[PDB]
Structures are given as C-alpha cells and as structure tokens.
Amino acid sequence: SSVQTAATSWGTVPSIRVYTANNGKITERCWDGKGWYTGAFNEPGDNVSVTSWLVGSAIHIRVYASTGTTTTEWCWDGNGWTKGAYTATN
Numbered sequence: 001s002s003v004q005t006a007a008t009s010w011g012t013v014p015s016i017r018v019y020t021a022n023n024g025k026i027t028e029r030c031w032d033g034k035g036w037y038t039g040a041f042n043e044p045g046d047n048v049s050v051t052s053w054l055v056g057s058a059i060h061i062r063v064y065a066s067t068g069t070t071t072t073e074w075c076w077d078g079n080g081w082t083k084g085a086y087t088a089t090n
C-alpha cells in the first residue's frame with residue numbers, strides 16, 4: 001500500500017539520505033546540496049530505519065531493514081554497503 005521511509009542527514013549543507021521501502025525493496029535517494037540522485041543502497045525489506053554519525057569528515061550510516069521478524073543491518077563506512085553484526089534478541 002503506502003511506502004515507508006526513513007531519513008538521516010549530516011553536516012550543514014547538508015547531506016540527506018532518504019530510504020524508501022516499496023513492495024519489499026528498499027532504495028535510497030541522496031542530496032548533498034546540488035540535486036537529488038539515486039544512491040547505491042538496494043536491499044530487501046518492508047520496513048526501514050536509519051541512523052548515522054560523523055567521525056571527523058567521514059560519514060557512517062547504519063540502515064535496519066526488516067522482513068517478517070528478521071532485521072538486517074547494512075553499513076556504509078565509505079566503501080560500499082556491507083552487512084553488519086546486528087542481531088535481534090530472544
């Protein structure tokens with residue numbers, strides 16, 4: 001039905017990342033001050049949340065993608081999206 005989004009931002013320009021879960025696929029749109037464009041993130045999920053932090057000038061992003069009761073963490077640390085160590089509790 002209705003897509004579900006999550007958003008994060010950093011800096012002062014700023015940079016913004018908006019993740020949209022649509023029909024089981026999460027994609028990413030990006031802003032760094034000069035126009036929206038499509039990001040590299042593509043992962044399965046019906047629900048999405050996100051957080052990010054800076055270490056100096058380097059952004060680190062964590063996206064939590066959920067299907068059913070399984071949540072997978074995806075990490076951006078400058079070098080492509082890698083699977084994180086996040087696991088659920090009992």
Ligand SMILES: OC[C@@]1(O)OC[C@@H](O)[C@@H](O)[C@@H]1O
Nearest residue numbers: 017028030038039040041076
């Ligand atoms: O410069 C765009 C980009 O590299 O920014 C960091 C992450 O949002 C990536 O998915 C995205 O493609």
Ligand SMILES: OC[C@@]1(O)OC[C@@H](O)[C@@H](O)[C@@H]1O
Nearest residue numbers: 062073075077083084085086
């Ligand atoms: O560098 C990746 C990592 O260690 O970053 C911190 C947390 O997001 C962890 O789950 C994740 O595996």
